[PDB]
Amino acid sequence: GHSYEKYNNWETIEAWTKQVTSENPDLISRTAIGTTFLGNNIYLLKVGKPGPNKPAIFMDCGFHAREWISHAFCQWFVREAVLTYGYESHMTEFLNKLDFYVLPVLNIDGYIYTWTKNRMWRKTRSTNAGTTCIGTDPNRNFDAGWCTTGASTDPCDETYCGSAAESEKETKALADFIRNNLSSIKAYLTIHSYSQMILYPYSYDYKLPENNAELNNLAKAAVKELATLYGTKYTYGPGATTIYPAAGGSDDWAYDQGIKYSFTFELRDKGRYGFILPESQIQATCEETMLAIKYVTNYVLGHL
């Protein structure tokens, strides 16, 4: 059975996407935007009060298989939205005014692999020509200074950038969706772990985005907001200097498409547990993250 305070396997998350949608048709619609290398369905949930020509915020979880708290967050967010609509003023206005396209798990094949074989797997599970080595790092597979820095051209490496930008069925599916909905998408949020950071472009180069000051101000306020709940401290800034230069990331790509508000969230913790964050921290991690996501949404809405 599905639980919002436990990490759920794919079979369970999939059944949940069906159930939550069927139980809240006036706030959620589910669609599949493609298939993974191994044939799993890439679901996308459109959360919001249906209406004509609504702007939207795109949010994904599960790019990297082992970052289990990421997958948990997308699920938590959906419940929060359906339960509080009509009661909490901010969420009510958010869902009335815009739609949140929530992609609960992008790298489903890798996620299944972490449950069945290797908990520390991070890449996709596609085969590579000329080698037994499996997988591509999806966050190094986008057309953003593709494979020019901080990425490997070797299939056996954990940071393999792929045979070409969008070589993976999963990243092509996401890029296609975003490209087909650019007019309505106002912000792009991608959830990962761990490190407790809010990063903005650019990661593939030390250059700064045109709206760098605004993004810094927004990230700074979002981390402040996040800390009000349990005291969790996040750092923030451009990817290249905050983490290190790494090309082919979805955040940089989305930004270069024209999406001015593009952020990568690195959830708890700082390394004590790393990727194996205990289930006992799911609730607090998700609750404080909600505050930052809602803060950003409120800002984006008032800046349309």
Decide: is 140 part of the binding site for Zn ion (CB under 5 A).
Answer: no
Residue length of the chain = 304
Nearer to Zn ion, 94 or 113 (CB): 113
Interface with Zn ion (CB under 5 A), residue from 66, 169, 192, 294 = 192
Half-sphere exposure (CA, 13 Å, Cβ side) for 118? 11
Instruction: Point out which span in 14-22, 32-40, 46-54, 192-200 binds Zn ion (CB under 5 A).
Output: 192-200
Tell whether residue 246 is among the known ligand binding residues: no
Nearer to Zn ion, 94 or 265 (CB): 265
Bridge partners for 264 per DSSP: 190, 199
Which residue among 88, 266, 287, 288 is the active-site one? 266
14 carries an active-site annotation: no
Please tell me the distance from the alpha carbon of residue 204 to that of residue 165, in angstroms, as a whole number.
14
Tell whether residue 66 is among the known ligand binding residues: yes
CB of 18 to Zn ion, least distance (A): 27
Nearer to Zn ion, 44 or 199 (CB): 199
Please tell me the distance from the alpha carbon of residue 231 to that of residue 217, in angstroms, as a whole number.
20
Nearer to Zn ion, 71 or 186 (CB): 71
Provide φ and ψ at 231, rounded to 5°. Answer: 85, 10
Interface with Zn ion (CB under 5 A), residue from 10, 36, 64, 268 = 64
Q: Which residues of 39-61 are buried (b: 16+ CB within 10 A; e: fewer)?
A: ebbbbbbbbbbeeeeeebbbbbb
**Cα-Cα-Cα-Cα dihedral of 210, 213, 215, 220, to 10°?**
170
Show binding-site residues for substrate.
64-67, 122, 139-140, 193-194, 244
List residues near Zn ion by CB under 5 A: 64, 192
Residue positions annotated with a catalytic role: 266
